[PDB]
Scaffold this active site. Structure first.
Site, PDB file in Angstrom:
ATOM      1  N   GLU A 105       0.461   4.060   9.527  1.00  0.00           N
ATOM      2  CA  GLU A 105       1.362   3.454  10.606  1.00  0.00           C
ATOM      3  C   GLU A 105       2.610   4.248  11.155  1.00  0.00           C
ATOM      4  OE1 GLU A 105       1.993  -0.529   8.641  1.00  0.00           O
ATOM      5  OE2 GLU A 105       0.879  -0.800  10.427  1.00  0.00           O
ATOM      6  N   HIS A 142       2.217   1.117   1.151  1.00  0.00           N
ATOM      7  CA  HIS A 142       3.414   0.239   1.155  1.00  0.00           C
ATOM      8  C   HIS A 142       3.536  -0.539   0.202  1.00  0.00           C
ATOM      9  CE1 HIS A 142       3.238  -0.173   5.985  1.00  0.00           C
ATOM     10  NE2 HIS A 142       3.494   1.200   5.521  1.00  0.00           N
ATOM     11  N   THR A 152       3.474  -6.243  10.375  1.00  0.00           N
ATOM     12  CA  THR A 152       2.213  -7.372  10.618  1.00  0.00           C
ATOM     13  C   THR A 152       3.201  -8.413  11.037  1.00  0.00           C
ATOM     14  OG1 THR A 152       2.038  -8.355   8.558  1.00  0.00           O
ATOM     15  CG2 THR A 152       0.712  -6.584   8.970  1.00  0.00           C
TER      16      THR A 152
END
Ligand SMILES: CCCSc1ccc(S(N)(=O)=O)cc1
Ligand SMILES: CCCSc1ccc(S(N)(=O)=O)cc1
Ligand SMILES: [Zn+2]
Ligand SMILES: [Zn+2]
Lengths: 261, 261
Positions: B102, B115, B197
């Site tokens: 990301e 993450h 998200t």
């Protein structure tokens, strides 16, 4: 209505412009894994680029960029159909982060990017009608980096102070727009994509020249600092900076190159 | 039904999740113009990361990633409140293009990204409540590159064939989560951002470690082929690939670094 920042920035364009969330979006990262030489990509011919020094062309600040209107006898030869010019304009970053091209190459932004917009005049009567139609548009992109002073780009940049605020308009005497193209225009990337601003129609044949042009540090600073995206009498002015779209996902697709080496 | 591809992909999330079009969005490109050394970024300490091999932790395919639930006694020491662990999960690309981190660094994607999500347990009783409060969440990000086989990551990946579809759950014996972190954890990037998200809440304190870890090509291929975003009985299955967001504009933010060179 739409902007490049805040609540009405790019992630929010698809609410009012549904194509912004559709297929074939530009710009993209041009990187080695997705490049494919195609010997079918022959050199374009730029016809009617040498604009009469006896005609004047309308420069506008449209609140999103600075745009120069171009005449429809200027065209690209070498595509299937003739594509006639309609306007040129630029995208850039800001003096703290002066890397505001829209396309990237191997993940890297260039300082700025020029777009010369054309429409398919063999199929359609004008750019507005072509814009949402099949094979409608062709845009040439020139990558810009800091380097030498560039007298040809200054034929545009010398007029920026007259189009400081949204709505303002100046006249620019014709000059040879081919002077804004880089060296070895035969060397380019080619893919099917979209407008990079609303309405984001997926009707653009992109040609991104392999070689960048240079402009001086002062010319780049002027472009970054001369314009506002607000009207002159807006009590809350905003500087026109960072007017590029982030790169879009591009998967299971190639970008074709006219060069292999 | 948000996704990472197609009409419900990331340019459309803001239609249903307004914070996705708001400020402070993640991920971002970490590049020199926006970096600033901050000597106040002292080392974090990882407490209770060494989970007992005799206990077991729930692995779940949530339709968007694979997540491992973590116990609240696992925490980070060194922020201004204690942040306790809630879950970890990953983002990745696809078998033919293993470049799905990301965050990017100087415009380049890494193969994948881990993450580890924590919440302020001094202030809030669970991560969901914390998730919509200012600096309610602290996420640690580890950049993952294709390299050597990594036995510690394989304590997660060896269970992927058991959580292939949305909603499925498996148990993973405890292991030392600190073995998923890279070398020289004292060197990191720190910035204020968001969930990557939906619902894109701008409530995350991000720490991205400077150094990547490695997993092998075979481990990436397992991760990239094992999982589906859809339920086991869905007649229109969708592969869980390319589950990363494009980088976001940096709305005048800097990124602070605990390393000066
Ligand atoms: C004929 C379409 C006029 S609107 C327009 C919007 C964006 C572009 S771009 N940046 O060249 O894709 C070009 C034209
Ligand atoms: C506590 C919030 C749970 S939802 C959630 C959504 C996204 C992330 S991310 N990818 O770490 O920003 C982490 C958590
Ligand atoms: Zn443009
Ligand atoms: Zn994540």
């Amino acid at each position: 209505k739409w902007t490049y920042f805040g609540p009405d920035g790019e992630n929010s364009w698809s609410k009012k412009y549904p194509s912004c969330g559709g297929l074939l979006q530009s710009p993209i990262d041009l990187h080695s894994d997705i490049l494919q030489y195609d010997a079918s990509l022959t050199p374009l011919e730029f016809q009617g680029y040498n604009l009469s020094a006896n005609k004047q062309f309308l420069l506008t600040n449209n609140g999103h960029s600075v745009k120069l209107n171009l005449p429809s006898d200027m065209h690209i030869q070498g595509l299937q159909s003739r594509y006639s010019a309609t306007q040129l304009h630029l995208h850039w970053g800001n003096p703290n982060d002066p890397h505001g091209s829209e396309h990237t190459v191997s993940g890297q932004h260039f300082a700025a990017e020029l777009h010369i917009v054309h429409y398919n005049s063999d199929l359609y009567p004008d750019a507005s009608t072509a814009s949402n139609k099949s094979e409608g548009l062709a845009v040439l992109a020139v990558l810009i980096e800091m380097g030498s002073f560039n007298p040809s780009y200054d034929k545009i940049f010398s007029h920026l102070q007259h189009v400081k605020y949204k709505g303002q308009e100046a006249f620019v005497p014709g000059f040879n727009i081919e002077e804004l193209l880089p060296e070895r225009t035969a060397e380019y990337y080619r893919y099917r994509g979209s407008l990079t601003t609303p309405p984001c129609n997926p009707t653009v044949l992109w040609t991104v020249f392999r070689n960048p042009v240079q402009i001086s540090q002062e010319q780049l600073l002027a472009l970054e600092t001369a314009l506002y995206c607000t009207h002159m009498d807006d009590p809350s002015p905003r500087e026109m900076i960072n007017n590029f779209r982030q790169v879009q996902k591009f998967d299971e697709r190639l970008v074709y190159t006219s060069f292999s080496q």
